[PDB]
Amino acid sequence: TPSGAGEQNMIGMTPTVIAVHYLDETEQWEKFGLEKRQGALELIKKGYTQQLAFRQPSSAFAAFVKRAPSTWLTAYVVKVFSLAVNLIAIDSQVLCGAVKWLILEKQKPDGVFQEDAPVIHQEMIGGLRNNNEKDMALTAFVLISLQEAKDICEEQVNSLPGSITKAGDFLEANYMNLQRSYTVAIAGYALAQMGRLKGPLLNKFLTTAKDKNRWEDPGKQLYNVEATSYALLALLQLKDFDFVPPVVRWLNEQRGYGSTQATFMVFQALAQYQKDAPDHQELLDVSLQLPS
Amino acid sequence: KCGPPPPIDNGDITSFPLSVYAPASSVEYQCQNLYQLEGNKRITCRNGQWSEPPKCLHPCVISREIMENYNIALRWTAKQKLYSRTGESVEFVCKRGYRLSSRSHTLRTTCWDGKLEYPTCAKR
Numbered sequence: 001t002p003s004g005a006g007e008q009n010m011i012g013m014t015p016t017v018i019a020v021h022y023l024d025e026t027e028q029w030e031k032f033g034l035e036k037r038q039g040a041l042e043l044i045k046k047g048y049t050q051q052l053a054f055r056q057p058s059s060a061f062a063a064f065v066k067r068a069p070s071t072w073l074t075a076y077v078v079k080v081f082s083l084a085v086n087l088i089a090i091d092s093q094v095l096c097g098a099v100k101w102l103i104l105e106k107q108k109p110d111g112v113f114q115e116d117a118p119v120i121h122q123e124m125i126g127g128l129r130n131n132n133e134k135d136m137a138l139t140a141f142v143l144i145s146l147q148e149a150k151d152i153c154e155e156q157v158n159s160l161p162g163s164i165t166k167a168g169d170f171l172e173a174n175y176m177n178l179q180r181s182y183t184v185a186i187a188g189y190a191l192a193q194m195g196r197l198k199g200p201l202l203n204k205f206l207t208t209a210k211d212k213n214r215w216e217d218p219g220k221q222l223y224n225v226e227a228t229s230y231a232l233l234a235l236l237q238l239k240d241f242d243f244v245p246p247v248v249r250w251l252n253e254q255r256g257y258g259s260t261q262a263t264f265m266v267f268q269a270l271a272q273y274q275k276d277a278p279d280h281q282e283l284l285d286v287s288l289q290l291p292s
Numbered sequence: 293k294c295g296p297p298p299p300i301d302n303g304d305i306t307s308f309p310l311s312v313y314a315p316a317s318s319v320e321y322q323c324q325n326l327y328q329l330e331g332n333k334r335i336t337c338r339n340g341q342w343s344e345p346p347k348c349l350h351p352c353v354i355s356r357e358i359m360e361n362y363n364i365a366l367r368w369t370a371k372q373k374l375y376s377r378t379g380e381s382v383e384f385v386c387k388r389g390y391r392l393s394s395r396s397h398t399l400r401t402t403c404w405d406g407k408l409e410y411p412t413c414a415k416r
């Protein structure tokens with residue numbers, strides 16, 4: 001066990017939250033063992049409660065009490081807690097306080113989100129660990145988390161929709177210059193979610209894929225799994241079910257250290273694919289993520 | 293007794309909102325990073341009514357785009373982009389061998405509310 005628990009606890013929360021989500025969304029609890037749901041819910045509660053000890057007076061999070069808070073970690077907390085809101089009781093002040101800190105403290109005038117205190121455990125951030133296009137990649141990552149929180153917090157936090165819009169403008173204004181498939185996939189999901197992916201941008205998003213079935217860049221393949229998952233989420237937003245089956249097959253065929261993001265994103269994307277797509281293909285195994 | 297506090301652009305209140313506020317009670321605003329509160333940061337529940345709320349003055353964004361033009365580049369640092377608060381100054385010199393063709397002072401300016409007037413330096 002590595003030491004900075006504000007981060008490590010989130011690494012450990014991740015498998016359970018996304019497994020439960022997957023099984024809820026695809027309604028596959030009967031097959032897996034419906035008896036095991038209550039136990040998983042309590043494990044999620046215990047992750048959430050443990051994370052609270054790393055919540056700073058500012059409502060931001062960091063690996064330790066006296067480390068500066070991380071923008072990335074605070075946004076990953078918002079995303080994970082948001083998937084759990086109807087799984088356990090998540091205090092809105094915790095979730096929407098973290099959202100407000102992002103908006104008030106870490107967003108730059110042109111919409112960019114900035115990281116002033118990177119996470120210690122860089123393996124937990126997946127393909128963000130790249131240094132080109134970090135403004136776009138991170139801004140997309142944070143905006144995706146803001147999108148998840150919009151309906152819980154729009155009331156508690158009035159500045160949220162405009163900060164959302166301002167992040168989208170920045171993504172839209174720079175999307176065409178992008179070179180890396182990872183950024184194209186992650187920013188493309190972020191834009192698609194807001195319906196703001198179209199014209200040359202949509203074309204660029206779709207034509208960036210290889211073999212009409214993956215988004216990839218030279219490097220750790222775990223980053224391409226995570227990229228393609230975003231891409232699959234962007235396609236589901238677009239309702240482009242024609243483009244989807246080869247993507248799903250390539251992802252399904254890709255069944256560790258540094259796999260928090262791959263795991264989170266594959267299970268999210270494949271859950272939504274089965275939830276949304278008419279006569280979807282038969283799909284992988286959740287007990288790895290959720291043992292007993 | 294007042295309802296929820298009004299919104300302001302590029303800012304929000306420093307506490308969590310409630311549905312009804314007893315009179316006498318105040319809340320403060322804060323602007324987003326690099327935005328400048330104009331007016332009183334605090335409002336009060338005045339006979340079932342909010343007192344007046346502040347403005348947030350825009351910073352000024354200095355792009356690689358704007359740079360390539362007026363033929364000025366960054367005097368001290370070499371960042372291809374820079375943000376300036378209202379009430380704060382930036383400083384350029386001219387591009388690849390030009391003269392100052394604007395006013396008898398303008399290389400040093402005051403970003404105010406998103407407005408910043410660039411010096412122009414013309415070719416040769």
Ligand SMILES: CC(=O)N[C@H]1[C@H]([C@H](O)[C@H](O)CO)O[C@@](O[C@H]2[C@@H](O)[C@@H](CO)O[C@@H](O[C@H]3[C@H](O)[C@@H](O)[C@H](O)O[C@@H]3CO)[C@@H]2O)(C(=O)O)C[C@@H]1O
Nearest residue numbers: 365366367368369374375376377380381382383384385400
């Ligand atoms: C928005 C912003 O960043 N405002 C800063 C600016 C900008 O960073 C800069 O002007 C852009 O090129 O810097 C300011 O401080 C400088 C100012 O006091 C000048 C006075 O002419 O001196 C600079 O320090 C110099 C020093 O004077 C030199 O002798 C030395 O060779 O180098 C030093 C640093 O390189 C200050 O940086 C500014 O007003 O321009 C302060 C703004 O708030």
